[PDB]
């Protein structure tokens, strides 16, 4: 894959008698790939391009 | 995986 | 893929006797990809383009 | 795939006696793919093109 | 993959009576790639090309 | 992977009567590759480019 | 995977 | 892997 | 691996 | 690995 | 693409007062395949899944 | 692409008062697979899987 | 890809008052893979999985 | 790319008054692979996963 | 790559009043992979997994 | 590419 | 590239 | 690149 | 590159 | 690189 820009921007701003609160499970970019094979195989090709 | 948030405000 | 910009910009604002709460599972891209193979193959060809 | 912009932008705000909620399971995208086989297979093709 | 900024820029600002909180599972970019046979596995090949 | 910049920054300001709080998993980059074969394997060939 | 946002108020 | 993150205030 | 935040306010 | 960050205010 | 068994097998046998002649312009197999973009373009994908 | 057996097996024999002549322009597999540019070219993804 | 046998057998056989005679242009496997960029591009992906 | 066996096994045999002749132009397997980028380019990914 | 034999066995017998003659160019295996930029580049990413 | 076979016999 | 073989016979 | 193979005979 | 076998019999 | 093998008989 190819990216222009890839901007993740996020604007958090409370100045009065308030209150903020956020969380996050993994704010960002995972790329993840993955091979794996059974057991007792045999003759496997096995490839992830990204 | 698995990926959880837990947030609480009282 | 390809792309031109990939933005994500919240906008997070709360200022007054006000309140502001938020929660994200992953916020942004999760660009996975996953071969496997079950017990006893053969003769196999996995493969993933992205 | 190609994309032009992939812009996601929220706009949050609550200033007064107010209160904001929000949460997302995976605000963003998910781009997964994947090739698994059963047991005791030969001659198998399997190729994911995103 | 080929990225052209990969910006990540949070705007954190609370100043009066006010509470700020934050939390995130790994804010950033998670590049994983991982090959794994099973047992008794013969004539394999695996290959991850990020 | 190419990059461009990889710019994270962070704006963390709080003055006034005010409470700012932040925590991180792993705020950054982490690009981790791993091979690993199964018990009484031959024949394996696994390789990591990213 | 699974993912989830647990989240409350009040 | 698993990620999480657990937040409260009161 | 597993990637955690555990945070509290009072 | 785990990595974790703990952190508590009173 | 997916084959079972991909089999060229030519009998080629000129014993008496005999002659024989042959002439291939690539006996066998050509798997090509091929990308190319034209001068000042931009936003475009372009994947070839054999 | 998987291939089940894959052979290619000539017979030639010419065993008198004879004469047997033969000529390959490449006489096996040609796998080839070619990305290319333009030239001022941008945001472009080129990508052959086999 | 992934292959079976990949078995290539000729047989080359004259015994009499025969003459035998032959050429190849690459009698084998070609396995080709190019990457190359036209002048003053950016903000390009290029990748061959074979 | 995974092989089962690549075998590549000539009979070349002339016991007569006979006369066997042969060329090659590399016999065998080429497993070529190449990456070259233009004059004046930036923001390039060129990747070869054979 | 992974090769579960690569064998390559030429059988070259001529015992009569006869004539055997035969010529390689690199009878073998040639695994070649090459890198190269081109002049006034930046930001470039070149890599070659076999 | 280009791929081509000359032969000939008298 | 270009590929060729050529065999003559007299 | 460029492979040929030229032979002849008399 | 460039890859050749020149044969001659008489 | 070039490979080359020239042989001739007579």
Request: charged letters at 0%; zero cysteines.
């Amino acid at each position: 894959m190819n990216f222009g820009a890839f901007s993740i921007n996020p604007a958090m701003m409370a100045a009065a008698q308030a209150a903020l609160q956020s969380s996050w499970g993994m704010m960002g970019m995972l790329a993840s790939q993955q091979n794996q094979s059974g057991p007792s195989g045999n003759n496997q090709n096995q490839g992830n391009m990204q | 995986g698995m990926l959880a948030s837990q947030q609480n405000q009282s």
